[PDB]
XYZ file of C-alpha atoms in Angstrom:
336
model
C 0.000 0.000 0.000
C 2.419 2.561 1.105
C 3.550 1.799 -2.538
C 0.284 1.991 -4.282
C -0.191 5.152 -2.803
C 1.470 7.371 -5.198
C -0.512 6.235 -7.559
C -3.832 5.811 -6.140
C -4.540 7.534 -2.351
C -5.087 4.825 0.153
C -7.768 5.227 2.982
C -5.892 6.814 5.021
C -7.434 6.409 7.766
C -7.134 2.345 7.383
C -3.471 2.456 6.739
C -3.843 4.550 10.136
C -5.757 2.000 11.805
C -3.375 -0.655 10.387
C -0.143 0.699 11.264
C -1.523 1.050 14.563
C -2.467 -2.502 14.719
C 1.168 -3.858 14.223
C 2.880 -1.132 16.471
C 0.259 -1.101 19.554
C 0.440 -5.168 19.767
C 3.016 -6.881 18.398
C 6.627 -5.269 19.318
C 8.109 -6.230 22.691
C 10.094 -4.408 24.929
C 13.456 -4.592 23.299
C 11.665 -3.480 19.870
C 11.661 -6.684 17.849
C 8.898 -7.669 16.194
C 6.493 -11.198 16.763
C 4.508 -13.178 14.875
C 0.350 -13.776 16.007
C -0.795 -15.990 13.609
C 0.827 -19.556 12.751
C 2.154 -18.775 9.861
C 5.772 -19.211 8.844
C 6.930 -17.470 5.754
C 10.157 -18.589 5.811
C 12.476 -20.907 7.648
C 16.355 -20.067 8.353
C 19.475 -21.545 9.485
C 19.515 -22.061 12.698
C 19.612 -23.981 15.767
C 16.192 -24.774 17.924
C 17.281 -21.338 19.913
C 19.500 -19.398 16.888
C 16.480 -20.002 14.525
C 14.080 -18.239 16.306
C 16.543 -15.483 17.604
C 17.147 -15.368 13.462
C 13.407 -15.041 12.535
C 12.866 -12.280 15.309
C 15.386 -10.391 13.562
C 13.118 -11.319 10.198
C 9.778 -10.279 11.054
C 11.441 -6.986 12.576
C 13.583 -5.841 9.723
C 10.853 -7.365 7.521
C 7.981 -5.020 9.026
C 9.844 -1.893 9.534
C 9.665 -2.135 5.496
C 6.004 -2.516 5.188
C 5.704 0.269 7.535
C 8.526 2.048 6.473
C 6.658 2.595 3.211
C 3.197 3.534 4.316
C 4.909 5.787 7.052
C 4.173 8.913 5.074
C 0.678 8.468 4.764
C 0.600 8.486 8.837
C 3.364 9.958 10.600
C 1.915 9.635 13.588
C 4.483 10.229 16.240
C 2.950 7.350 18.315
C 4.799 5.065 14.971
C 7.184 6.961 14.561
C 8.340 6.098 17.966
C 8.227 2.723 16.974
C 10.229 2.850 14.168
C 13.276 3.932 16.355
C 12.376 1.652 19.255
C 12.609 -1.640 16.709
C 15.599 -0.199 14.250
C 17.518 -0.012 17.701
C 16.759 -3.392 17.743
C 18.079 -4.253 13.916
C 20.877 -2.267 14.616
C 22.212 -3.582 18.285
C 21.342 -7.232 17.222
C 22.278 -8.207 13.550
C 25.756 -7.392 13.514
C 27.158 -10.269 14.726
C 26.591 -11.733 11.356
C 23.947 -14.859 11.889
C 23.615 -15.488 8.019
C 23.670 -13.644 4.550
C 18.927 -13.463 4.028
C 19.573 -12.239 7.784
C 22.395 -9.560 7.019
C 20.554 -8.317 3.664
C 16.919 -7.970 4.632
C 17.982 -6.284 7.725
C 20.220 -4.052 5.352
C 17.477 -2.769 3.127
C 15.014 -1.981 5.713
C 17.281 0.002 8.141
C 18.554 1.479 4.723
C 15.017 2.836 4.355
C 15.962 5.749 6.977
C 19.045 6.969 8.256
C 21.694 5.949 5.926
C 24.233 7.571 8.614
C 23.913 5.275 11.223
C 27.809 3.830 12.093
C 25.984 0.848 12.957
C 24.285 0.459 9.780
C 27.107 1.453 7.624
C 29.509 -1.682 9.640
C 26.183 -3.999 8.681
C 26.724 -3.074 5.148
C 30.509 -3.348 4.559
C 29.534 -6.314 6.653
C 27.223 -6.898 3.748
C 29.506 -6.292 0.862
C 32.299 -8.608 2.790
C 29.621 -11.423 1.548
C 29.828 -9.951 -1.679
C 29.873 -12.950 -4.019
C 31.244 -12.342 -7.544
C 32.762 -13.044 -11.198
C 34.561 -12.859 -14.566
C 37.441 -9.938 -13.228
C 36.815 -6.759 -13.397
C 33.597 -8.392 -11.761
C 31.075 -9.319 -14.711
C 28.571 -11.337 -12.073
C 27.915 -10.313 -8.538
C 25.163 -11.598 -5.882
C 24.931 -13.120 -2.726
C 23.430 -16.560 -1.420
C 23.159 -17.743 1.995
C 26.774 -18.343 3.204
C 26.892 -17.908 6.995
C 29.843 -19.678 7.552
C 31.329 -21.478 5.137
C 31.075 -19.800 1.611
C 31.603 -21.910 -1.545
C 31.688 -19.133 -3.621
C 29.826 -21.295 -6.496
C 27.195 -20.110 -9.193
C 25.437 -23.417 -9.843
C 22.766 -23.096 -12.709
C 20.616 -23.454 -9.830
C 19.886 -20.063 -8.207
C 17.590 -20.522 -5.227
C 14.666 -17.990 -4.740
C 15.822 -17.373 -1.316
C 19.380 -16.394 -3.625
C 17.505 -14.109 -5.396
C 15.822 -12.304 -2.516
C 18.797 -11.369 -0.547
C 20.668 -10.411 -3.522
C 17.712 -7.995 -4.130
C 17.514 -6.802 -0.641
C 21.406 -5.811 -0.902
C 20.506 -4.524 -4.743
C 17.448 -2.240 -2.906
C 20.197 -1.137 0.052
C 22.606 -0.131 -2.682
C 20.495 1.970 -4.328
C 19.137 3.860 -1.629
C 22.851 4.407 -0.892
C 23.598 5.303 -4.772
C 26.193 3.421 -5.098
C 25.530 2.657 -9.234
C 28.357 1.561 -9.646
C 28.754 -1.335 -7.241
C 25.328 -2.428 -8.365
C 25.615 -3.839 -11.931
C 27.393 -6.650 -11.703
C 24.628 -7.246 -9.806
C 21.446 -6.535 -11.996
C 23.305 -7.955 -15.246
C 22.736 -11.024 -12.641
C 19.492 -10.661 -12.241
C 17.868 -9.675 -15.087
C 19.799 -12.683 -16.554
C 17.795 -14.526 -14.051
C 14.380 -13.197 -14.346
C 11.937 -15.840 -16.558
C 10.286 -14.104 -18.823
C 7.196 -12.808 -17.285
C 8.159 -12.041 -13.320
C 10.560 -13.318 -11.600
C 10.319 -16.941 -11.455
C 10.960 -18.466 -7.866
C 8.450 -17.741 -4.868
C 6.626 -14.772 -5.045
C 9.169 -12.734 -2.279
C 11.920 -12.728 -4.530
C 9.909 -11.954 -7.121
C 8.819 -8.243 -5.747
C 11.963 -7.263 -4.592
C 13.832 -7.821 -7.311
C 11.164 -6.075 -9.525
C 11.150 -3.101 -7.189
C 15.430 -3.159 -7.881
C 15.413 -3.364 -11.483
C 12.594 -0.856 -11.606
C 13.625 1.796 -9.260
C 17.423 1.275 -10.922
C 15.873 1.713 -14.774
C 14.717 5.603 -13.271
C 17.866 5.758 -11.801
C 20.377 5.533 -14.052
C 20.565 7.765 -17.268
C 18.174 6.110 -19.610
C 19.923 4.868 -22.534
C 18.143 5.006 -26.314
C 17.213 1.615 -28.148
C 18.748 1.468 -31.285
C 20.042 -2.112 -31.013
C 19.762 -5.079 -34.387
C 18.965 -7.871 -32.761
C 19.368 -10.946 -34.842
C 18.923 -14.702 -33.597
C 20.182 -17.905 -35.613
C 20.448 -21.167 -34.781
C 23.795 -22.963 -34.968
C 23.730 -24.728 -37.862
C 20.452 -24.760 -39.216
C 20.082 -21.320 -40.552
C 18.519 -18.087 -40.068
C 15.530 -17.278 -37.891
C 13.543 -14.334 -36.908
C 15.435 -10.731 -36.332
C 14.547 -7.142 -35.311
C 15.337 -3.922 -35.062
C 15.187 -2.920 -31.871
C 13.145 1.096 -30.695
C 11.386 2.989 -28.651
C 8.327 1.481 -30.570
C 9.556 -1.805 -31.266
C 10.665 -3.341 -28.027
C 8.714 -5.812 -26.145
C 8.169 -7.961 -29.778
C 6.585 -11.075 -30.135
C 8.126 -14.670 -28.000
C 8.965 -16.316 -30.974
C 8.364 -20.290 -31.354
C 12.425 -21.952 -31.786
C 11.104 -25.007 -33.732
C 14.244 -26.650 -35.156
C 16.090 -29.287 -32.787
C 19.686 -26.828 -32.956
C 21.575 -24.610 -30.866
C 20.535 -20.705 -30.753
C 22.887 -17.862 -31.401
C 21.375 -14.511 -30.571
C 23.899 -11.112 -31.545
C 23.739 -8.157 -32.124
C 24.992 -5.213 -34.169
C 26.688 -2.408 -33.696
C 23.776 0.291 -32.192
C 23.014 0.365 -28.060
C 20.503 0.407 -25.793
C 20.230 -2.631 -23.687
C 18.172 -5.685 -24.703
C 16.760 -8.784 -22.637
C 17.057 -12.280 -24.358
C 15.524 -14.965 -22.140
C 14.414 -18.598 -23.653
C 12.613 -20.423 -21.242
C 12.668 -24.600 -22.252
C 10.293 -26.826 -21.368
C 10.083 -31.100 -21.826
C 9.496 -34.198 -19.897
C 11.381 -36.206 -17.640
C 10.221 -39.972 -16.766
C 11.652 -39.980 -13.954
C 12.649 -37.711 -10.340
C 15.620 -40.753 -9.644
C 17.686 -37.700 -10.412
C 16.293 -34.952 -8.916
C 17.064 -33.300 -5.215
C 14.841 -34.833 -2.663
C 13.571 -32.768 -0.137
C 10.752 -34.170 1.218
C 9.736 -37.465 2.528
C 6.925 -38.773 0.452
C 4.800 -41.560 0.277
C 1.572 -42.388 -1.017
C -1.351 -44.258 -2.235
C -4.077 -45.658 -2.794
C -7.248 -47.745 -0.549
C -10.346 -48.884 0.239
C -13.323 -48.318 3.017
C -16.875 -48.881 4.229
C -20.213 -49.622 1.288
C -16.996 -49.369 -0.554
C -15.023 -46.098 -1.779
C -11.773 -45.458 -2.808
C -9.337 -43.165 -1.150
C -6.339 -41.733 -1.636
C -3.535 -40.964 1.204
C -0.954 -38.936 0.538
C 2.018 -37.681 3.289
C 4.732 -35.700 3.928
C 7.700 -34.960 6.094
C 10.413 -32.906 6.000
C 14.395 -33.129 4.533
C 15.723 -30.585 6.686
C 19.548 -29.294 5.203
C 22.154 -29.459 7.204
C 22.016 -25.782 9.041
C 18.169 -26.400 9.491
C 16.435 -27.858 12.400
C 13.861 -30.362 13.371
C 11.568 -27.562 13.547
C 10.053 -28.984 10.494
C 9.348 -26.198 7.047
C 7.741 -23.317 6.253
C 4.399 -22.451 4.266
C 4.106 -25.049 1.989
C 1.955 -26.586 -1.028
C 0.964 -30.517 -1.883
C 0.002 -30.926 -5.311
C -1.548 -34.247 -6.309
C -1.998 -34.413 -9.880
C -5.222 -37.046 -10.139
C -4.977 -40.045 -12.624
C -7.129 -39.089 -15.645
């Protein structure tokens, strides 16, 4: 909402009322923030004690961006207050670096006010010391969830939760400015980005939308003049196009012919997305990365009707605990 809101006014009164609903109830005495409901968004490395003390530190930072965006709409001092009480919190608690979705969150949502802080400026060189990058001068640049260890590795993989810190570091950097630190880091997401959103989870998803956005009115906006032609290997020629201010965003073209692809480009400039998203089918999950205990099947009962039983537990990694997973989906795709 505090979002929407420059675009279309918001009750105000509601994102009052609202506001006023998270502050009055749910912040305890050292300014944290804590969870009513059930619900677990996420789940974090941690131990049965260090996991929680993680998540605390999750929910605040977390918050004091939702209200840290709808703030303007109701500076009421009684929030305001409340803001301070629970960034003292962020800032006397993170630092002694838990994990890398801890240290980046945290970043971008103290980073929302009061860029000056000492504190907040040692949590994000403490930030950038996580820094992981590649090709030199540094082509490639995110972050993953290293705590610890850090294999700096890039594996074709890229987890949602990869993308989401990343993006909460991309969002701190540019409410710092710091332009120049930041595009290793978008050429590393917009490389990542399926066509369409953002691809994993829906968190992610957002804040790295809100980066690439808020960067594309940021820096100097460049003019599309780029030839964009696409081949495949061996095969020959397919589709090509100019590439302007009135041709962009051009049709998702079909690649029919079992061949490599070869996209380049001319001389011109601008700056140009090519993503190919491929699709088939697998027999079989033998290969795949269990993470989840399954079992199934199917029975009988009185009268007779057949039912299906279907069950789960959880693969917990190895920094994760036997707290058992977050919000999660079962999908049970019936026999035709």
């Amino acid at each position: 909402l505090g979002q929407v809101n420059k675009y279309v006014e918001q009750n105000q009164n509601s994102i009052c009322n609202s506001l006023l609903w998270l502050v009055e109830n749910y912040q305890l005495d050292n300014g944290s923030f804590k969870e009513n409901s059930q619900y677990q968004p996420i789940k974090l490395q941690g131990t049965l004690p260090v996991e929680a003390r993680e998540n605390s530190l999750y929910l605040t930072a977390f918050t004091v961006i939702g209200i840290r965006k709808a703030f303007d709409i109701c500076p009421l001092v009684k929030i305001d207050t409340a803001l301070i009480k629970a960034d003292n919190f962020l800032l006397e608690n993170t630092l002694p670096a838990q994990s890398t979705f801890t240290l980046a969150i945290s970043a971008y949502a103290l980073s929302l006010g009061d860029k000056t802080h000492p504190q907040f400026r040692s949590i994000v060189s403490a930030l950038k010391r996580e820094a992981l990058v590649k090709g030199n001068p540094p082509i490639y640049r995110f972050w993953k969830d290293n705590l610890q260890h850090k294999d700096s590795s890039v594996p074709n993989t890229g987890t949602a939760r990869m993308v989401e810190t990343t993006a909460y570091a991309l969002l701190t950097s540019l409410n710092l400015k710091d332009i120049n630190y930041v595009n290793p880091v978008i050429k590393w997401l917009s490389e990542e980005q399926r066509y369409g959103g953002g691809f994993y989870s829906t968190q992610d998803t957002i804040n790295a939308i809100e980066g690439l956005t808020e960067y594309s009115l940021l820096v100097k906006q460049l003019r599309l003049s780029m030839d964009i032609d696409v081949s495949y290997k061996h095969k020959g020629a397919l589709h090509n196009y100019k590439m302007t201010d009135k041709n962009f965003l051009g049709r998702p073209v079909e690649v029919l012919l079992n061949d490599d692809l070869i996209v380049s480009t001319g001389f011109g400039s601008g700056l140009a997305t090519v993503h190919v998203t491929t699709v088939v089918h697998k027999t079989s999950t033998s290969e795949e990365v269990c993470s989840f205990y399954l079992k199934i099947d199917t029975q009988d009962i009185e009268s007779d009707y057949k039912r299906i039983v279907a069950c789960a537990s959880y693969k917990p990694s190895r920094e994760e605990s036997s707290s058992g997973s977050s919000h999660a989906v079962m999908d049970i795709s019936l026999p035709t």
